[PDB]
Amino acid sequence: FTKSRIPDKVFQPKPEDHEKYGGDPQNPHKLHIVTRIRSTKRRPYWEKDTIKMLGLQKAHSPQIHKNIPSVNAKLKVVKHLIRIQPLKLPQGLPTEETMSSTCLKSTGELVVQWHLKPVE
Amino acid sequence: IPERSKLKFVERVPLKDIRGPSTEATDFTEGNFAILALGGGYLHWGHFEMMRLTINRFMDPKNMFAIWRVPAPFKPITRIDHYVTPVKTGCLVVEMGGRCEFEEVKGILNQVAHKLPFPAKAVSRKTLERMHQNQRERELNNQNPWTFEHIATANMFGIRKFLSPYDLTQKGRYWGKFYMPKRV
RNA sequence: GUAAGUUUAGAUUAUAGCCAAAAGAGGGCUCUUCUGGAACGGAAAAAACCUUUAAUAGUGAAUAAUUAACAACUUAACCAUUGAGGCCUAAAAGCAGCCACCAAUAAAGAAGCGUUCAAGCUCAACAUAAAUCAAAAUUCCAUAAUUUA
RNA sequence: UCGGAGAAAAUCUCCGAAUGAUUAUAACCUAGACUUACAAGUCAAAGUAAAAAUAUCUUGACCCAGAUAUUUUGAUCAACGGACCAAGUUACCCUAGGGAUUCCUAUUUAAGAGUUCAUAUCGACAAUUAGGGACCUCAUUGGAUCAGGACAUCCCAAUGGUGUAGAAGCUAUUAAUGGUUCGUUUGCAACGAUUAAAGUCCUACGUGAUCUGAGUUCAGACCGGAGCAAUCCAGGUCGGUUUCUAUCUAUUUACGAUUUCUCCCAGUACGAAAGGACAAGAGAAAUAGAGCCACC
Ligand SMILES: [Mg+2]
Ligand SMILES: [Mg+2]
Ligand SMILES: [Mg+2]
Ligand SMILES: [Mg+2]
Ligand SMILES: [Mg+2]
Ligand SMILES: [Mg+2]
Ligand SMILES: [Mg+2]
Ligand SMILES: [Mg+2]
Ligand SMILES: [Mg+2]
Ligand SMILES: [Mg+2]
Ligand SMILES: [Mg+2]
Ligand SMILES: [Mg+2]
Ligand SMILES: [Mg+2]
Ligand SMILES: [Mg+2]
Ligand SMILES: [Mg+2]
Structure with missing residues (x-):
């Protein structure tokens, strides 16, 4: 049992894949939302290390990571233990005023105005 | 008709050998039934x-x-x-x-x-051809999105912890010395 | 991406593992290397399989794994015409045996078989109608159950 | 102990060394490294000195003793990290502990057997994810009592087939019902006389806090064979002490029968004769179970 190298074809999407997941092959998203959803117990030690490097020690708690190849390379190692979701900014990036009023939704949207009131 | 139609005699005295798909004698050479x-x-x-x-x-x-x-x-x-x-x-x-x-x-x-x-x-030649055609037909028209090769090759689910290195080549058709025809 | 690492000083204990999975080497076992494990949950009971970041109070909540699962494909009722084709066994009949592989016909070569051989019981013709697979030893051992989205 | 070759680095497959001859005689000093637990072991620039560059090819510490006039030499210490120098035996034994106590058979196939005829009865090659059993050497199980269970059935019972005329048999299905003897020589068998039959196995030899003979196996003693002896042998033989008051669990108060022979049918059916049935029906015993005492 040794580390495996996945064929490059796995990470080359198909036209229907873009339709299903609703992601444009151009203007790719910038930030990942990564959550660990399985345990590192009974997994090889290299998988254990990458999980600690990425900060996913606690399960079901989301961490933000750069959508850059070096980060992606580690994520591919632990692809089976995590869920990757594209961070969305419906109302734009938070500013100094809106830093204290943010909330990350389950949908993947970081809203900058969080009122806890009926939409009305 | 060959002159020596009858089978010849065989001299009594001159793990992977039987653990995979054959690469020899897989095609009819002269006869029609085998x-x-x-x-x-x-x-x-x-x-x-x-x-x-x-x-x-x-x-x-x-x-x-x-x-x-x-x-x-x-x-x-x-x-x-x-x-x-x-x-x-x-x-x-x-x-x-x-x-x-x-x-x-x-x-x-x-x-x-x-x-x-x-x-x-x-x-016979026809039956062997039919068997291969049925095998290919089953693979093409399979309605199961998931297949053994894709899961194993992509290491989905952390599967390769439980798989042998040879399994990727066989793709689940062959287990040990046994061949599973229906298994696509 | 991340927070560890080298050197200096001090110091014991340890030096017999266990089981699963993977590749080899000897020859089922037995050596060698690589990976994981040590539930309070599930697999029945279950150190070693799967789910599980530590440990706290609460008469809250969302979830993970989760011994269960739904045998497999045409006879019908009919009709059968010689010089015994020769020769090795008197002579060998579709037909002892061997070789020709035979005769007209609307239509028949001799299939089993019968025959010392021919007895002939009568297959195929003519002539009529339709037609390959996938859940032994104390005393059985949860109970039951085919359809409500 | 170390070195060389393969497996390929864990144990296996093979060859060699405890040097050998050749020789130009191969100096001193000193960066950086290899290897390595320690110890030992490797390579080497620069500088200097000799000469007129070169050593080529294929291994044992410390101590302690020496030899020369600083220089040197001492191991089948080979159990090869090496005790300065020590062997047998014990069944007379002891203490501290650790352990243990091919051939069937059932399926599938069917050349050949069976005059003819594969499968009445069988049967080659094989098929079952199928069930059981260096030159020499060798060591728990009977019986008694009481039995529980399996069925892969030994007898009793119901049937299919036949190369089943009858009678005897052969083969297969079904069935676990009750039964399945007494002795002789025996140490494992070997026989005698019977029976309807004297089944095959499982229960930690089923069962030693129920009993008993061996064996394991010793303290004594002989032969035979070893060894200088003590002793020894998986070689003989004769002799030879294991006790237990039951604390717990469990258990201690009915049943509705098995087999054999004779008689009859009938010396008939059948059959050339020889020989010789079935069912139906009646009567005797044997054993087991449950009781009883008029007689003996
Ligand atoms: Mg050193
Ligand atoms: Mg120099
Ligand atoms: Mg030593
Ligand atoms: Mg030594
Ligand atoms: Mg004695
Ligand atoms: Mg009994
Ligand atoms: Mg039976
Ligand atoms: Mg006892
Ligand atoms: Mg008592
Ligand atoms: Mg004595
Ligand atoms: Mg005695
Ligand atoms: Mg005496
Ligand atoms: Mg004695
Ligand atoms: Mg009592
Ligand atoms: Mg009668």
């Missing part, structure tokens, strides 16, 4: 005699002929007690041909196949 190995097994000289005696007696020299499609026993066995000829699933053990239909040779070939050390079947 016995197809459906599993991995060792053919010792005793099996060779049964094939030789049974086939030779029934076949008609005027209209029938036969040939051997496997080498003579060469692999040593120790308690050098005797030598066994290895065979892989998909191999054609013996080939028959002549101005006869398959139905005539079905009974003898099937009877001979039953007594072989490994599962086997009697297949």
Whole structure:
């Protein structure tokens, strides 16, 4: 049992894949939302290390990571233990005023105005 | 009709060998009817005699002929007690041909196949072609999105912890010395 | 991406593992290397399989794994015409045996078989109508159950 | 102990060394490294000195003793990290502990057997993810009592087939019902006389806090064979002490029968004769179970 190298074809999407997941092959998203959803117990030690490097020690708690190849390379190692979701900014990036009023939704949207009131 | 229609004699004295898909004797050469190995097994000289005696007696020299499609026993066995000829699933053990239909040779070939050390079947050129066509047809029209190769190759689910390195090549069709036809 | 690492000083204990999975080497076992494990949950009971970041109070909540699962494909009722084809066994009849592989016809070669051989019981013709697979030893051992989205 | 070759680095497959001859005689000093637990072991620029560059080819510490006039030499210490120098035997034994106590058979196939005829009865090659059993050497199980259970059936019972005329048999299905003897020589068998039959196995030899003979196996003693002896042998033989008051669990108060022979049918059916049935029906015993005492 040794580390495996996945064929490059796995990470080359198909036209229907873009339709299903609703992601444009151009203007790719910038930030990942990564959550660990399985345990590192009974997994090889290299998988254990990458999980600690990425900060996913606690399960079901989301961490933000750069959508850059070096980060992606580690994520591919632990692809089976995590869920990757594209961070969305419906109302734009938070500013100094809106830093204290943010909330990350389950949908993947970081809203900058969080009122806890009926939409009305 | 070849002059030496009858099967020739075989000399008594000259793990992966049977653990994968065959690469030899998989195609009809001269005959139209032959016995197809459906599993991995060792053919010792005793099996060779049964094939030789049974086939030779029934076949008609005027209209029938036969040939051997496997080498003579060469692999040593120790308690050098005797030598066994290895065979892989998909191999054609013996080939028959002549101005006869398959139905005539079905009974003898099937009877001979039953007594072989490994599962086997009697297949003509048409039947072997049909089997391959059905295999390809099943793969193309399969309605299961997931397949063994994609999960294993992509290491989805952390599966390769439980898989052997050879499993990726076989793709689940072959387990140990057994061949699973329906398994796509 | 991340927070560890080298050197200096001090110091014991340890030096017999266990089981699963993977590749080899000897020859089922037995050596060698690589990976994981040590539930309070599930697999029945279950150190070693799967789910599980530590340990706290709460008469809250969302979830993970989760011994269960739904045999497999045409006879119908009919009709059968010689010089015994020769020769090795008197002579060998579709037909002891061997070789020709035979005769007209609307239509028939001799299939089993019968025959010392021919007895002939009568297959195929003519002539009529339709037609390969996938859940032994104390005393059985949860109970039951085919359809409500 | 170390070195060379393969397996290919864990144990296996093979060869050699405890040097050998050749020789230009191969100096001193000193960066950086290899290897390595320690110890030992490797390679080497620069500088200097000799000469007129070169050593080529294929291994044992410390101590302690020496030899020369600083220089040197001492191991089948080979159990090869090496005790300066020590062997047998014990069944007379002891203490501290650790352990243990091919051939069937059932399926599938069917050349050949069976005058003819594969499968009445069988049967080659094989098929079952099928069930059981260096030159020499060798060591728990009977019986008694009481039995529980399996069925892969030994007898009793119901049937299919036959190369089943009857009678005897053969083969297969079904069935676990009750039964399945007494002795002789025996140490494992070997026989005698019977029976309807004297089944095959499982229960930790089923069962030693129920009993008993061996064996394991010793303290004594002989032969035979070893060894200088003590002793020894998986070689003989004769002799030879294991006790237990039951604390717990469990258990201690009915049944509705098996087999054999004779008689009859009938010396008939059958059959050339020889020989010789079935069912139906009646009567005797044997054993087991449950009781009883008029007689003996
Ligand atoms: Mg050193
Ligand atoms: Mg120099
Ligand atoms: Mg020593
Ligand atoms: Mg030593
Ligand atoms: Mg004595
Ligand atoms: Mg009993
Ligand atoms: Mg039975
Ligand atoms: Mg007792
Ligand atoms: Mg008592
Ligand atoms: Mg004495
Ligand atoms: Mg005595
Ligand atoms: Mg006495
Ligand atoms: Mg004695
Ligand atoms: Mg009592
Ligand atoms: Mg009667």
